[PDB]
Amino acid sequence: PVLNLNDPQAVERYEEFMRQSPYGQVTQDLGWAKVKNNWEPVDVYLEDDQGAIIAAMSMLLGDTPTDKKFAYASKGPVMDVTDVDLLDRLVDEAVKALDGRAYVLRFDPEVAYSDEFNTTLQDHGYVTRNRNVADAGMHATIQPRLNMVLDLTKFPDAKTTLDLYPSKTKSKIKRPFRDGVEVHSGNSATELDEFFKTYTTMAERHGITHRPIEYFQRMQAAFDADTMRIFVAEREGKLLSTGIALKYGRKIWYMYAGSMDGNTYYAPYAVQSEMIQWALDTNTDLYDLGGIESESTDDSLYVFKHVFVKDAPREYIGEIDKVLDPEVYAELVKD
Ligand SMILES: [Mg+2]
Ligand SMILES: [Mg+2]
Ligand SMILES: [Mg+2]
Asked: Which residues take part in binding substrate?
């Protein structure tokens, strides 16, 4: 069925399912639609024989250069996507809800890539985008398929961040702190202003664009301090680096970062250490440092994230596309 966003009861049940599911994703939370306020939300779900929600998909519809919309369920749906027969049923609900307005319904769940799963999906009629598409560019997957994920369940007795690492790494993490770097965290306007300054500075330094502050303000309005937290690293009165982490489902996700120019005293390591400590303190299963371009030392993202994730990066199935308008799809989506 389709969720009536104006039905508080229905919304609460949908949210409860999302928040409690081991497959929950912040980008599938109804709060994500508030962040992506320029996209149209269309949410659907399936119920089991007891009438309880067993699967849900929060879609966001965006415009394209054609008469069709692009329907996207970021890191959704929320269910065991390998249960493809169940997935088909949920997608059928989504297709009904879209009512021919979209040329495609795409979802990129955080499930490991495998030839078997890839094949099963294709056998069910989905078009998958992973190893068959470009690594970067306008043809690449929206979300990086290679992600550096720290599995904290491998360290049941870990009390602090240092307990998860080899001595060489403990040294790297301790460095900023011994040099005076201090981290404070929260989700108020003050921390947001600190984040934004480092974020725009970082953007200007790398000659790249940055999202407007309103984007993050909507995020702050949508998520409480137990879900969204901004970590700010400073040294004796000087702002050095920041990071935004979102706690949801089985993980804490390092989503945004910023760092001032010049000497930052390895503040980014301090930020990571505190985000990981938050994951430990909350008994979270995973700490997701996000994507990398490649598992190579030539990738600055990899080198940095590899300090905190020694396991191989997780490689996801990529984009699973339910093609609705084949002609427009072929026009807008290519390898
Ligand atoms: Mg258009
Ligand atoms: Mg713990
Ligand atoms: Mg590790």
From this structure: 36-39, 103, 211, 215, 256
Resolution at which this structure was determined, Å = 1.7
Which protein residues have a CB closer than 5 Å to ligand 1 (ion)? 63
User: Is 37 known as a binding-site position?
Assistant: yes
- b or e along 74-109 (b: 16 or more beta carbons within 10 Å of the residue's beta carbon)? bbbbbbbbbebebbeebbebbbebbeeebbbbbbbb
Q: Are residues 256 and 172 in the same domain?
A: yes
Q: Given the residues 319, 321, 322, 325, select the one marked as catalytic.
A: 319
Judgement on whether residues 13 and 106 belong to the same structural domain of the protein: yes
Is 215 annotated to bind ligand? yes
CB 60 within 8 Å of CB 72: yes
Considering the candidates 145, 250, 305, 314, report the single residue annotated as catalytic.
Answer: 305
User: Which of 210, 203, 306, 199 is closest to 257 using CA atoms?
Assistant: 199
The experimental method is X-ray
Same domain, yes or no, for 129 and 15?
Answer: yes
> Given 43, 108, 110, 325, which residue is catalytic?
108
Q: Is 108 a catalytic residue?
A: yes
* CATH value at residue 93: 3.40.630.30
